[PDB]
């Protein structure tokens, strides 16, 4: 049904998912002069040393790396969060050219891509219950800019050939997501939504100020993936990002001066 083409892309989504026009939709533009420093915000606590990755999957919209979230192995706490959030998957959004691809923007600046590390609030017992709650998910968003290669991304890049088309998956164990983080954990935060259907308004967004660098050759390999299934006409997976939505009655808070 929905996708990112001319006839089923973001401008059409509201017809099947009316919450598309809701009050806390993502992504948004981060105006750095209007964001408010909030000294009551705690530092982020990212505890990923015991992460267990299982599988990488092309789902027709992006590729997801999935984790075992049956226990508190890889968790996100602190920051604006109350309680413990478990890592369940990560994925990227990216562009057909280096000057677009991110979902969030900073002072209208687009980055080449954006990484989303998706976590769910354990107080709700399973992921399906969590997405129905206003504080059910926490997504950590990290910008990618093109420059020097990120060594810790290369294992992801090398496996992409094996999941070229929709519905394909491959074993992907022992991947350490700490290799994807920037040096600093300074962030902006605001309450928002999933950026794809079903567009539920269940996310605390935590967007890191410092981007990571990837090489042009790395991001080029993302662009060789396919939206379509095997045996269907080829449609390159590029520009799988939703444009910025109105901020409405929300304030973006910063953890840093
Ligand atoms: C293709 C659907 N993806 C949806 C439904 C998945 C079940 S999810 O894990 O809730 C999730 S997280 C995001 S994002 N872009 O806001 O981080 C989109 C989605
Ligand atoms: Zn995403």
From Swiss-Prot:
Binding of Zn(2+), residues: 91, 93, 116
Effect on the protein of changing residue 61 to G: Impaired activity, not rescued by 4-methylimidazole (4-MI)
Annotated keywords: Acetylation, Cell membrane, Cytoplasm, Disease variant, Lyase, Membrane, Metal-binding, Osteopetrosis, Phosphoprotein, Zinc
pH dependence: Optimum pH is 6-8.
Effect on the protein upon substituting residue 59 to A: Reduced activity
Catalytic activity annotation: hydrogencarbonate + H(+) = CO2 + H2O; urea = cyanamide + H2O
Binding site for substrate: 195-196
Superkingdom per UniProt: Eukaryota
Additional remarks: Target of drugs used in treatments against glaucoma disorder and breast cancer.
Matches recorded under PANTHER family: CARBONIC ANHYDRASE, CARBONIC ANHYDRASE 2
Protein name, entry field: Carbonic anhydrase 2
Lineage, top ranks: Eukaryota, Metazoa, Chordata, Craniata, Vertebrata
């Amino acid at each position: 049904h929905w996708g990112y083409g001319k006839h089923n892309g973001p401008e059409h989504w509201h017809k099947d998912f009316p919450i598309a026009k809701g009050e806390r939709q993502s992504p948004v533009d981060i105006d750095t002069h209007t964001a408010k420093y909030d000294p009551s915000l705690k530092p982020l606590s990212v505890s990923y040393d015991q992460a267990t990755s299982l599988r990488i999957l092309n789902n027709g919209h992006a590729f997801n790396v999935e984790f075992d979230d049956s226990q508190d192995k890889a968790v996100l706490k602190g920051g604006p969060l109350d309680g413990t959030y478990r890592l369940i998957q990560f994925h990227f959004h990216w562009g057909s050219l280096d000057g677009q691809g991110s979902e969030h923007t900073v002072d209208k600046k687009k980055y080449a891509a954006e990484l989303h590390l998706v976590h769910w609030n354990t107080k709700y017992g399973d992921f399906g219950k969590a997405v129905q709650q206003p504080d059910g998910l926490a997504v950590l968003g990290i910008f990618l800019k093109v420059g020097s290669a990120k060594p810790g991304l290369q294992k992801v890049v090398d496996v992409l050939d094996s999941i070229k088309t929709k519905g394909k998956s491959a074993d992907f164990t022992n991947f350490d997501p700490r290799g994807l983080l920037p040096e600093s954990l300074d962030y902006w935060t605001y309450p928002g939504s999933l950026t794809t259907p079903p567009l539920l308004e269940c996310v605390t967004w935590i967007v890191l100020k410092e981007p990571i660098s990837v090489s042009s050759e790395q991001v080029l390999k993302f662009r060789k993936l396919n939206f379509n299934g095997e045996g269907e006409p080829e449609e390159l997976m590029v520009d799988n990002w939703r444009p910025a939505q109105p901020l409405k009655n929300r304030q973006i808070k910063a953890s840093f001066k």
